[PDB]
Write a protein that binds this ligand. Structure first.
Ligand SMILES: CC(=O)N[C@H]1[C@H](O[C@@H]2[C@@H](O)[C@H](O)O[C@H](CO)[C@@H]2O)O[C@H](CO)[C@@H](O[C@@H]2O[C@H](CO)[C@H](O)[C@H](O)[C@H]2O)[C@@H]1O[C@@H]1O[C@@H](C)[C@@H](O)[C@@H](O)[C@@H]1O
Ligand SMILES: CC(=O)N[C@H]1[C@H](O[C@@H]2[C@@H](O)[C@H](O)O[C@H](CO)[C@@H]2O)O[C@H](CO)[C@@H](O[C@@H]2O[C@H](CO)[C@H](O)[C@H](O)[C@H]2O)[C@@H]1O[C@@H]1O[C@@H](C)[C@@H](O)[C@@H](O)[C@@H]1O
Ligand SMILES: CC(=O)N[C@H]1[C@H](O[C@@H]2[C@@H](O)[C@H](O)O[C@H](CO)[C@@H]2O)O[C@H](CO)[C@@H](O[C@@H]2O[C@H](CO)[C@H](O)[C@H](O)[C@H]2O)[C@@H]1O[C@@H]1O[C@@H](C)[C@@H](O)[C@@H](O)[C@@H]1O
Ligand SMILES: CC(=O)N[C@@H]1[C@@H](O[C@@H]2O[C@@H](C)[C@@H](O)[C@@H](O)[C@@H]2O)[C@H](O)[C@@H](CO)O[C@H]1O
Ligand SMILES: CC(=O)N[C@@H]1[C@@H](O[C@@H]2O[C@@H](C)[C@@H](O)[C@@H](O)[C@@H]2O)[C@H](O)[C@@H](CO)O[C@H]1O
Ligand SMILES: CC(=O)N[C@@H]1[C@@H](O[C@@H]2O[C@@H](C)[C@@H](O)[C@@H](O)[C@@H]2O)[C@H](O)[C@@H](CO)O[C@H]1O
Lengths: 87, 87, 87
């Protein structure tokens, strides 16, 4: 089981991505309880990065399944497939 | 052997967490030599994130041992167990 | 195959490091297409962190090959070996 962690803002908000059993899932903290996030994609390995434009977070998650990495994008309205390609 | 890296401030300070042999340890840079940090917890996988409140760093380390992830918190006065729960 | 991801600035710029087959490589985004970066070093595991001094990025990549981690530094003019030592 393998994780990636990101955080932003002053609360802060935290997101922890966990790869387990070929599934990546997401747990979320926004200042009170931890909860399960919307992100669900295939993979055995995960990394992530984020940035703020004002108060709005943008997240990129790099989900690797076997020999292929897929980027997933959060830009305020759902998870969308990004343009990233690997070697 | 698997690592996680965080950094903050303008020096910068860097912390590198290494999982090896079911032990996670910490090496630290604050502008001169690298040294061994106080963090020691069980795990075969590690991620980390941090933020600043003014000059004061807050660190969260996610230590995974088998099928369970535990959060460890640095908030200026020692490492304490966090509220994070996984699936 | 295992990745690390960093990002900076407002574009943003993103760097994704991938360890595969004992080689770590780098893919780069600066606002248009993804491209292959200059970084190439040995390892089966990678983490990374970065910071800005004004507009200038500084990157540290921690490349682990077997039982040894080596730090690699980007400070505006090529990749150089850092002072990091592990246990
Ligand atoms: C508190 C919370 O849950 N916020 C989530 C929110 O997730 C909800 C679920 O709580 C609910 O059960 O289901 C609905 C779908 O019917 C939804 O998935 O979704 C919102 C809207 O996308 C998002 O809240 C925003 O979060 C940011 C954090 O900076 C900010 O506070 C903003 O004002 C909120 O509106 C939350 O979604 C999670 O966080 C995202 C950044 C991303 O990680 C998601 O995958 C998470 O589910
Ligand atoms: C330079 C240094 O060592 N700072 C450490 C400091 O660690 C010391 C050890 O050096 C000494 O050998 O043992 C004592 C215990 O008897 C202690 O563990 O501990 C201080 C206080 O917690 C902390 O320094 C603070 O670091 C921040 C960095 O932003 C800042 O400069 C502040 O002004 C300092 O007081 C250092 O602890 C390390 O960094 C922490 C953030 C965390 O990573 C720890 O696990 C590290 O040991
Ligand atoms: C757009 C781009 O490619 N920028 C790279 C640039 O890489 C070039 C290659 O494009 C070309 O094919 O080969 C030459 C060697 O002959 C070179 O490797 O290299 C520049 C200069 O080092 C660097 O651009 C700078 O990037 C920063 C990003 O913040 C900023 O925009 C600045 O103004 C640019 O000058 C790019 O190098 C990449 O990014 C680095 C941070 C690091 O990740 C490298 O390993 C990447 O190759
Ligand atoms: C926000 C931005 O800089 N660009 C968006 C486009 O690219 C997506 O995000 C960037 C950061 C990088 O992760 C890409 O791989 C990813 O595809 C995106 O394609 C476009 C879609 O309409 O939206 C831009 O805002
Ligand atoms: C600093 C903060 O926002 N909350 C602290 C509490 O939660 C701890 O930190 C947050 C960021 C998250 O990592 C939690 O899982 C973690 O438990 C903490 O329980 C409380 C203890 O007295 O202190 C708050 O400051
Ligand atoms: C930029 C800085 O704080 N120090 C540089 C020196 O150390 C290198 O960078 C730091 C952040 C840390 O990663 C070290 O392990 C790494 O060696 C560097 O040795 C020196 C070389 O001339 O340049 C400093 O600017």
């Amino acid at each position: 089981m393998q994780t990636a962690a990101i955080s932003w803002g002053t609360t802060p908000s935290i997101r922890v991505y966990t790869a387990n059993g070929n599934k990546i899932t997401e747990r979320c903290y926004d200042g009170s309880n931890w909860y399960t996030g919307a992100f669900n994609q295939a993979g055995d390995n995960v990394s992530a990065t984020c940035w703020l434009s004002g108060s709005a977070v943008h997240i990129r998650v790099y989900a690797t399944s076997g020999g292929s990495t897929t980027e997933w994008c959060w830009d305020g309205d759902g998870w969308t497939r990004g343009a990233y390609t690997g070697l």
